[PDB]
RNA sequence: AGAGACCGAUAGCGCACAAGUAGAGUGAUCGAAAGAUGAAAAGCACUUUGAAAAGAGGGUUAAAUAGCACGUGAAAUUGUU
RNA sequence: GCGUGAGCCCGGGUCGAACGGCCUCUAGUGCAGAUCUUGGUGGUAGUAGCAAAUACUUCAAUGAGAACUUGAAGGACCGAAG
């Protein structure tokens, strides 16, 4: 449909998208700004043993009153947690992307996670039964989640802006002495 | 001609659970044999003795 | 496989509890197939399903402690909880 | 580097047998009497798996009927079991081998070493 | 039946819609919310991934930055850069 | 860009059928408050919490996926004012 970044030739990546996924938002957004511009397969080993319960993810903005643990030090945080359920929801779109980038002819050897979203979605309705014949709302957060993966090149080792710089408006009296140092010294 | 994915899908259902037991069945023959060699063979009884 | 039905069926036509109803396991797959009484008693007819027998609950203590009280054994001061006429009453004694 | 001959070697004998008696009673002090008779399962389950480092043991309901015998609080202070590694043959498996326990049959498990078993 | 220096979907009758309907109360009675794709459905053939729902291609149209959650799509609040 | 000010005018993007300047007439004509009315949305927060009624376990089958689906084998409860 639209995408979030289109500065992405569609003939040069892959892209993919899901909507109305029922999964929590706050946990799910932590799993993919944890997974960013890392490499396909070494992000989806990294994920697939987040299941395995082997390595956490970082929680870093919705971390409120959470217990902590001894595997989020390598990431410098003393919060983090195990979401296996958003887990197995990004298989699956990561798994769809890498069939559309075989589909479409692309080298699979080396992809980078050019960029990824998160996205609230509407709510659901549901009620509850609290106490003195009151009742209250239960709802749920589902969310969208999109995605879009292309090349690798990371090869800049040259500039002329430099060379460009040059000096057009001077004042008389500092073009003399540029000249007369000019001849004083050449 | 089919009428379109959903169809080979359904009959690949069945298709699929046939051949995968099936396979089970023959990697179980082909280690049988191997088994039935490695008992009879006579080689491994004088080598453990050493 | 579902076999909810089977066993009520099988007890219906047994005339016992759905408790007490035997179904071999290794042929589940064609004994779904039933979906009637008819067939359910051709299947028991078949030896397919049986009836479980009935748990052990034997009086032999009680009987012995019975023949064990018919000659004075355990009737002593400290084995009685109601009163003398409660026991045996003046009323019919005398009557 | 010798690793890997290790495993071929093994590959000739990985099929294998033992005896092995285990103490129960000092993994159970103190535990639930609501929860021995379930937990002493998945010690046993932690126990095959220390020893023969597979990762996938599969229990015998012989075994389940001697640890299940006097109730969940009775639980023997020790038992006496064989343990026999063999291949998995289903090709869509993680790793490719699985252990098998089952109970051995004795009056009593005292005084008994552990001993590999040759047919 | 004919008209207006009247209102224009939180307005105008409670009702521009299967409205005195759905719903609550034993009962007398109380009583809502809800209009707009496009000129014409021409409402996405078929390929592929996927358990499915769905995605990517590829198609119709002047436009899908109009896809039956459909004209225009502001603020509170949220995501990436 | 203009005016002290309420405000007016232009450039760029989106969109698709009606709209302004000047002089008179007319009014349901200018909002931050009223524990204002209706609708929508936050922090608190991935927090409080999901703790009465004794209790579960092994193998096999179906299935993309099984503690709370099915079969068999154990262990238990209700214990005739069930
Ligand atoms: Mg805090
Ligand atoms: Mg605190
Ligand atoms: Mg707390
Ligand atoms: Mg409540
Ligand atoms: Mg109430
Ligand atoms: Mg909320
Ligand atoms: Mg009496
Ligand atoms: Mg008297
Ligand atoms: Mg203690
Ligand atoms: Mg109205
Ligand atoms: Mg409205
Ligand atoms: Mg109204
Ligand atoms: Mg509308
Ligand atoms: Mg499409
Ligand atoms: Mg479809
Ligand atoms: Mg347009
Ligand atoms: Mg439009
Ligand atoms: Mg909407
Ligand atoms: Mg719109
Ligand atoms: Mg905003
Ligand atoms: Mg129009
Ligand atoms: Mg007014
Ligand atoms: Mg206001
Ligand atoms: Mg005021
Ligand atoms: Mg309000
Ligand atoms: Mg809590
Ligand atoms: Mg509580
Ligand atoms: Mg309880
Ligand atoms: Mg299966
Ligand atoms: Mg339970
Ligand atoms: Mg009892
Ligand atoms: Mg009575």
């Not at chain 1, 390595?55 to 195990?82: D, I, L």
């Not at chain 1, 009742?135 to 500039?159: D, F, R």
């Not at chain 4, 005896?19 to 002493?40: C, D, S």
Request: overall charge positive; charged content about 30%; aromatic content about 4%.
């Amino acid at each position: 449909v639209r995408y979030a970044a289109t500065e992405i030739a569609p003939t040069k990546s892959a892209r993919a998208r899901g909507s109305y996924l029922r999964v929590s938002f706050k946990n799910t957004r932590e799993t993919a700004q944890a997974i960013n511009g890392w490499k396909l397969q070494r992000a989806l080993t990294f994920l697939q043993n987040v299941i395995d319960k082997k390595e956490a993810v970082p929680m870093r903005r919705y971390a409120g009153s959470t217990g902590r643990t001894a595997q989020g030090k390598q990431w410098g945080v003393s919060r983090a947690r195990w979401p296996v359920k958003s887990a197995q929801f990004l298989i699956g779109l990561l798994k769809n992307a890498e069939a559309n980038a075989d589909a479409k002819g692309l080298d699979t050897g080396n992809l980078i996670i050019k960029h990824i979203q998160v996205n609230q979605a509407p709510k659901q309705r549901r009620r509850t039964y609290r106490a003195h014949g009151r009742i209250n709302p239960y709802m749920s957060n589902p969310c969208h989640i999109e995605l879009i993966l292309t090349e690798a090149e990371e090869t800049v080792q040259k500039s002329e802006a430099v060379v460009r710089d040059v000096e057009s408006h001077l004042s008389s009296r500092q073009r003399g002495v540029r000249i007369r140092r000019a001849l004083t010294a050449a | 001609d089919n009428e379109n994915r959903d169809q080979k899908r359904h009959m690949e259902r069945k298709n699929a659970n046939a051949r995968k037991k099936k396979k089970a069945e023959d990697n179980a023959r082909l280690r049988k044999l191997v088994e039935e060699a490695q008992a009879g063979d006579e080689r491994i009884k004088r080598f453990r003795q050493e | 496989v579902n076999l909810r039905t089977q066993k009520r069926l099988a007890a219906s036509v047994l005339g016992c509890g759905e408790g007490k109803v035997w179904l071999d396991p290794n042929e589940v797959s064609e004994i779904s197939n039933a979906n009637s009484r008819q067939s359910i008693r051709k299947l028991v007819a078949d030896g397919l399903i049986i009836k479980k027998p009935v748990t052990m609950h034997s009086r032999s203590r009680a009987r012995e402690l019975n023949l064990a009280r018919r000659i004075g054994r355990h009737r002593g001061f400290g084995k009685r909880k109601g009163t003398a006429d409660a026991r045996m009453p003046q009323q019919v004694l005398w009557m | 580097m010798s690793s890997t001959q290790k495993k071929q070697r093994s590959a000739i004998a990985d099929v294998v047998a033992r005896e092995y008696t285990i103490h129960l009673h000092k993994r159970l002090h103190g535990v639930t009497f609501k929860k021995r008779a379930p937990r002493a399962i998945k010690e046993i389950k932690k126990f095959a798996q220390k020893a023969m480092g597979t990762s996938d043991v599969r229990l015998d309901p012989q075994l389940n009927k001697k640890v299940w015998e006097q109730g969940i609080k009775g639980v023997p202070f020790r038992i006496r079991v064989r343990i026999s590694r063999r291949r998995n043959d289903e090709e869509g498996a993680k790793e490719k081998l699985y252990s098998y326990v089952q109970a051995v049959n004795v009056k009593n498990p005292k005084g008994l070493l552990t001993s590999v078993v040759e047919e």
